């Protein structure tokens, strides 16, 4: 069914803040291809009291060059306005993410079964621009029971309100705030805690590695954890010592937690609890705002290269993938010219082990060799340089993409 399948393990940490969040890095996103019309189904498997039940979702066409966050086109077996309980957001560097609200019921079940709903695994089906069906599987190594409830908004109104607005972009927050302390020029058993609130969602974060009793002048890095589904890219925070009234001693602090999603709403608020010699005692808050930025890096990271030979008979010994299964059960290689024009025509350059060169897509050719390196052959090169895009993958490989500039011969 699936032409390439990727397994993954989901890592909860702490209480569920109000939504599930999954990151899928392996899917491809070609560079320079603004007509990259990818199509996606999403399937979720729910275990409600021991009964295996499913929830399929449709997301339709993708326009990475123009749109970032996608609401489902439809759903099967959902509750009232079920499609409005999901989101799929691009993140850049060929990465994307999936989010689902968990404080409301996704699917319909009879009275008594509501408390028993739990998630076992998720599948993401991904039709490529070239038609290839990529797939992802995520397994809740330890499921979680869902708890429906309309949790309130909580305001720590007695908190000092600094005006540096927290801009959430690409699910990854990054904000730096100043601090005024009663001296504490050296360790005062500093501890910090953060909380984000809005629209039923509550994200609370804690220090890893204990608490601060080992300050140094200058910069001070420390790890953090947020109650949620931690990203494969870690959360973190860094403190900075001071600058060059009432004995106020200046400090500045930087943070970046990134299991953060838009379900908080444009109205949500962040809360930061820190402490000197006192779970946090000194407070600062800051309003949350979500950027409508389109991720400007969705192009898959490219092995940028330049090539040159005589005439139009140019070639390129295309290497293996990173971490290839040498015996290569099933393999696929595809390429196209930069900034293509027509979806039907410019995207017919595919090869496999069994399938030689098919119809369509002239100017290109190639095959594997006893070298096992794919020696590609091209023709019809113009009087000026042109750029070529190439992608390769084998079973249980990690996808590799090459950017090859066929620079014309010099003077």
């Amino acid at each position: 069914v699936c032409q390439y399948t990727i397994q993954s393990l989901i890592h909860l940490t702490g209480e569920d803040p109000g939504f599930f969040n999954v990151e899928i890095p392996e899917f491809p996103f070609y560079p320079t291809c603004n007509v990259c019309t990818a199509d996606v189904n999403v399937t979720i498997n729910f275990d409600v009291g021991g009964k295996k039940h499913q929830l399929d979702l449709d997301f339709g066409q993708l326009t990475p060059h123009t749109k970032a966050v996608y609401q489902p086109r439809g759903a099967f077996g959902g509750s009232e306005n079920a499609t409005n309980l999901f989101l799929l957001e691009l993140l850049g560097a060929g990465e994307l993410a999936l989010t689902m609200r968990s404080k409301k019921l996704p699917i319909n079940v009879t009275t008594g079964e509501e408390q028993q709903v739990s998630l076992e695994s998720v599948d993401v089906y991904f039709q490529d621009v070239f038609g290839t069906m990529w797939c992802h599987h995520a397994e809740m190594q330890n499921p979680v029971y869902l708890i429906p409830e309309t949790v309130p908004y909580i305001k720590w109104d007695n908190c000092n309100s600094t005006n540096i607005t927290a801009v959430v972009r690409a699910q990854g927050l990054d904000v730096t705030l100043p601090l005024s302390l009663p001296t504490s020029a050296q360790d005062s058993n500093f501890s910090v805690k953060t909380q984000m609130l809005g629209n039923e969602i509550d994200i609370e974060c804690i220090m890893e590695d204990g608490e601060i009793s080992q300050v140094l002048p200058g910069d001070n890095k420390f790890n953090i954890t947020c109650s949620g589904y931690e990203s494969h890219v870690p959360s973190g925070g860094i403190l900075t010592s001071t600058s060059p009234p009432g004995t106020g001693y200046a400090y500045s602090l930087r943070l970046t937690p990134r299991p953060v999603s838009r379900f908080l709403g444009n109205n949500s608020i962040l809360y930061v609890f820190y402490s000197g010699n006192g779970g946090g005692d000194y407070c600062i808050q800051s309003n949350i705002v979500f950027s409508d930025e389109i991720p400007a890096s969705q192009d898959m990271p490219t092995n940028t290269t330049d090539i040159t030979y005589v005439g139009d008979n140019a070639t390129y010994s295309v290497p293996m993938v990173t971490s290839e299964d040498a015996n290569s059960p099933n393999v696929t290689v595809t390429a196209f010219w930069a900034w293509p024009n027509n979806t039907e025509t410019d995207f017919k350059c595919k090869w496999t082990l069994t399938s030689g060169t098919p119809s369509g897509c002239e100017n290109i050719s190639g095959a594997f060799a006893s070298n096992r390196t794919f020696d590609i052959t091209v023709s019809g090169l113009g009087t000026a340089p042109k750029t070529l895009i190439i992608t390769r993958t084998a079973t249980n490989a990690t996808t590799t993409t090459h950017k090859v500039i066929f620079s014309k011969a010099p003077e």
Partner: antibody
Amino acid sequence: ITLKESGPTLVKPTQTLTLTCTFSGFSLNTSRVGVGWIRQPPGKALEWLALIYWNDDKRYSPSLKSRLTITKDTSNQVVLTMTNMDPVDTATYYCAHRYSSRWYWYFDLWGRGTLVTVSS
Amino acid sequence: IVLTQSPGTLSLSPGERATLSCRASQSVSSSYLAWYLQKPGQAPRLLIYGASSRATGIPDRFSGSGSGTDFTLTINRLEPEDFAVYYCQQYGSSHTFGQGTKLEIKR
């Protein structure tokens, strides 16, 4: 918070085994709490047996789901049941408490346990 | 679904440090493991979560570690009070316990 075990400390081979856990300091009709049983055949390792949650879902040891049932009787009682006994089942049996609802999870509190002998 | 601990009945002098390994065949989501303590004639006591998080009443005198296929437990400044049986339990999957380690004072 406390838990107590109760049941027959001797059962005949192939007969049925019934053990009751009585507890105080928490309510299970309210949320987030789960109760389960663990056993230790003297000297051997601990073996998890069964678990039941506030939402009344029940999950058992995979190899012993064929012979087990765990139920709920009063505001403060949980009853385990085990069938088709064999003398190798002879072990000390515990019932324990959990405060989370994260499916598979640690055990926070423990009863002092009660021994079950299995022999004619 | 398996756990395997260090040798049995380790005998140490008080004031030394304990070193208990809890190796595993499949890598649990390393955030999810606990350590337990039982003394014959009593019932098991809870010690640790995620190999580092300490339960109520427990002092700094205890420290676990490790991830995936290997989790480790240590006890500092050994006291005669401490010498009993020890276990490691995995969650994040079907519940399973190690086969146990035991402690003896080298009087």
